[PDB]
Design a protein around this nucleic acid. Structure first.
Ligand SMILES: [Zn+2]
Length: 132
DNA sequence: AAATT
DNA sequence: AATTT
DNA sequence: AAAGCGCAAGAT
DNA sequence: ATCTTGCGCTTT
């Protein structure tokens, strides 16, 4: 596709576009993912690169808000829950804090993601395991 | 606070 | 220096 | 004592 | 502007 279509993805801050490409702003020398929450730049200052690597190669450093140099969190986050599920499969109660420490996530994110991935809270999951 | 104007 | 997210 | 929950407050 | 954390209160 052309860059104008890519541009519309950016103005739309469309997450579906993340990974597909990365845009760079010559006035800042920073590159971001299409869904970056940062105010947008003027079209004339933007350019696109198929991926971070190429961006770096071109002298642009990653944005500190969208971390466009790291791959899609998707899997990473999924790996987090799975591990938490296993740590909860024991009679002795595990607090969200001890759990968060273990999977290395702010208790807020862990709790939100867990209920999002499993469908219940870490607490319930441990109770369910005990149950059956 | 960090990006962009 | 001021705006914008 | 810890989980949950809505909202103020802090951070990016 | 948008998202995360801290708080006080009720429920587990
Ligand atoms: Zn960014």
């Amino acid at each position: 596709m052309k860059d104008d279509q890519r541009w519309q993805s950016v103005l739309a801050r469309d997450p579906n576009a993340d990974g597909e490409f990365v845009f760079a702003v010559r006035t800042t020398g920073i590159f971001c993912r299409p869904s970056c929450r940062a105010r947008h730049a003027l079209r004339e200052n933007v350019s696109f690169y198929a991926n971070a690597s190429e961006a770096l190669a071109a002298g642009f450093r990653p944005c500190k808000r969208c971390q466009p140099d790291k791959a899609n969190p998707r899997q990473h986050r999924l790996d987090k829950i799975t591990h938490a599920c296993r740590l909860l499969e024991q009679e002795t109660p595990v607090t969200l804090e001890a759990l968060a420490d273990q999977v290395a996530m702010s208790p807020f994110h862990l709790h939100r993601l867990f209920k999002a991935t499993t469908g219940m809270t870490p607490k319930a999951w441990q109770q369910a395991w005990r149950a059956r």
